[PDB]
Design a protein around this ligand. Sequence first.
Ligand SMILES: [Mg+2]
Ligand SMILES: [Mg+2]
Lengths: 288, 288
Amino acid sequence: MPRTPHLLAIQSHVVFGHAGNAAAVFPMQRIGINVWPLNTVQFSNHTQYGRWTGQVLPPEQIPALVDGIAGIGELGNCDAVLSGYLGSAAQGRAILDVVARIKQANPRALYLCDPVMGHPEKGCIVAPEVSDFLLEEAAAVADYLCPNQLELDSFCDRQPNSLADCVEMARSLLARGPRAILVKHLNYPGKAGDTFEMLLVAADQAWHLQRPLLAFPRQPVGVGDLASGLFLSRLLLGDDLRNAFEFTGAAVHEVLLETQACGSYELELVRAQDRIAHPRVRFDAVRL
Amino acid sequence: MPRTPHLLAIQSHVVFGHAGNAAAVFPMQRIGINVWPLNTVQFSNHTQYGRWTGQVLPPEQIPALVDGIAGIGELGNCDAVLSGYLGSAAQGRAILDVVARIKQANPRALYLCDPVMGHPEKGCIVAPEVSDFLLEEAAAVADYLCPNQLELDSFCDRQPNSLADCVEMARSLLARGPRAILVKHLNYPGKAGDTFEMLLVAADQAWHLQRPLLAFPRQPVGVGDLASGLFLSRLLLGDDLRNAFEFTGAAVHEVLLETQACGSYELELVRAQDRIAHPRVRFDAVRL
Ligand SMILES: [Mg+2]
Ligand SMILES: [Mg+2]
């Protein structure tokens, strides 16, 4: 059995429930990744409850922690950096500094950026300096950029007419530097109302993944965090682009099926773990 | 399949490597526990490297976080509280306040205290107010108290002549309130030099567990954290005292075997995970 990959995950932490690192870390470890969790905040619970308690790490604590890891000579063992929601451009910059430092120590390290500008329940909830930093700075250094449709539309300053337009939008982002664009959640006029769709676009290839949309009274939080981390993990474990894409789609569906069957608002990560590791159902990606 | 237990784990976090919550959380989730990780610190790496970076949570942030969970109405779902190393008596008190609040919301909740006063590599490294708080306050409310021999000897103000004396020492701690005393690491005159031994003592019963001591150039950190969390998890999953005890012994040995076979200083938790969930070898406890 080959060496276990190492991944530095720089996101929110919640004590109860699942969001950010609390949505991603356990699933990635479960499928064979040594995760280094750098928690950018510690809250009681995620913000979508409309109430929470906790303090946010000042952004300088991010490169300080990485400096500590450099101090024990371990930074070269890091195979990837993963980021998600950012509370400020200052936090974003601290993350990019850490990405550059890790790439210095290991030139093969990957950076995956999950740009978060809001959620479908509300709209854009991020300051212009955050959305501007994501496009102008993070996208310029990210190996993999993983927007939802909201961020895709903002990045491109374009609203799609069709699935074709979403494909061209993702393609147009490649000119910025990333080797692939994962659109983790599609929304375009004429998309079937009962379907959850994803796109993966590289210069090489374009893939469309379709699965049934599950009904919930309240949209569970951290699905994007889960998808991003699993996708990156699969790539570190040697999957090609299409197989990482299909695994992610299949594993996220298992979590959601378990979450739904339990009547839970929080993702049933522990209960569904065997089906994260080995999903029963595999939805095939279609080439565009 | 029965409901997944919930456990609040209130300990240190390290970004790289394994100690405190970073030694315990993943293994407990892996065997079927929903863990609520409340990180009392976030350091770059554990302190036994002799260098590290990070800030410590002020102790008032502990009941504040739990207050947040109460605010979303979830505190009653907590089945256990787990603590380990304490940086101050003030931190200890905040943990006990949280234990009392949880026991109010769920009278069946268990508190397991892993009292940490040092490690065998050095000696006692904790202030008298910490070691005094552990005995006088934590032991008075803990359902399960899990000392190493160092803490057993300090608590009893007694040095053992034999294994028999260690048994009587553990027994004498029951008068303080705990339903069982797990001595996670035994050391007494005449113990075989190549053996790792544990005791579990309840009013009911006394068990001795023996396994081979593995050779390492540097003692791996977090073995006690791993053992405490697995033990408690097994009890939440319905094991009796002897079976929780034997599972813990077996699962910790698998991690150590993988850690040793890799030539690693840090615990190989991810690599060994299938053998945490289902240990190959089971060492039988012997009744005393
Ligand atoms: Mg997200
Ligand atoms: Mg310990």
